[PDB]
């Protein structure tokens, strides 16, 4: 749970 990491499905 870091805000700026990949927020997408894969």
């Amino acid at each position, epitope marked *: *749970a870091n805000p700026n990491v*990949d*927020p*997408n*499905a*894969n």
Partner: antibody, heavy 123, light 107 residues
């Protein structure tokens, strides 16, 4: 083409609640993180919230933490921003934005924004 | 908290002029910098991503440079459609924006 359209803005009384909506088309909504950003003359462009593709991870700006809640209904291709305990400093144009696509990068911004919806807090 | 500051705040230039906008971050953001263009009544539009990479459809007259704390956005020859407000944005720790640089038409 990727397109986002915000709705739900308007004139609202202080201390009340309001839910904004962001509708997505032209891409697989269920596979992308989504953002809310707001713009006011007083505070410029200010990020508000982000929600993960699956609706799980959610992060908020300090200015809105505890009062605003982000959600999404992937079956309706719709992103939501629930705003509670609204105050005058929340008056702004609220934009919704799509997270940048997955790459080898470890940090992610946003590419496409919507037209925006105007929220005016006034008595 | 990373604070982005831009310079100039307002610029008056003629069509065909070369314009350079500078953005400074309070701490090192490596190359996690993006440049947006915003016209009145319209949403911001992404022009450059990760400091130097031009987005699809953006004319090659736009270019970006820099790493760490100092970044620049360059328009080689201004077109009437380029007169707008330009924002920088860091995306390494949350997402914060500069105050904007308004490029107005000199006549």
């Amino acid at each position: 083409q990727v397109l986002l359209v915000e709705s739900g803005g308007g004139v609202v009384q202080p201390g009340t609640s309001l839910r904004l909506s962001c509708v997505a088309s032209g891409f697989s909504f269920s596979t992308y993180g989504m953002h809310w950003v707001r713009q006011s003359p007083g505070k410029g462009l200010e990020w508000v919230a982000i929600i993960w593709y699956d609706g799980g991870n959610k992060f908020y700006a300090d200015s809105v933490q505890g009062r605003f809640t982000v959600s999404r209904d992937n079956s309706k291709n719709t992103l939501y921003l629930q705003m509670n305990s609204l105050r005058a400093e929340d008056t702004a144009v609220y934009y919704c934005a799509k997270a940048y696509r997955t790459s080898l990068d470890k940090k992610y911004g946003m590419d496409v924004w919507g037209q925006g919806t105007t929220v005016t807090v006034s008595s | 908290d990373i604070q982005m500051t831009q310079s100039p705040s307002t610029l008056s230039a003629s069509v065909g002029d070369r314009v350079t906008i500078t953005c400074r971050a309070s701490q090192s953001i490596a190359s996690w910098l993006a440049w947006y263009q915003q016209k009145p009544g319209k949403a911001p539009k992404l022009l450059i991503y990760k400091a130097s990479s031009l987005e699809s459809g953006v004319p090659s007259r736009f270019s970006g440079s820099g790493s760490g704390t100092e970044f620049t956005l360059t328009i080689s020859s201004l077109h009437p459609d380029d007169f707008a407000t330009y924002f920088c944005q860091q995306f390494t720790s949350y997402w914060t924006f500069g105050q904007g640089t308004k490029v107005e038409i000199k006549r």
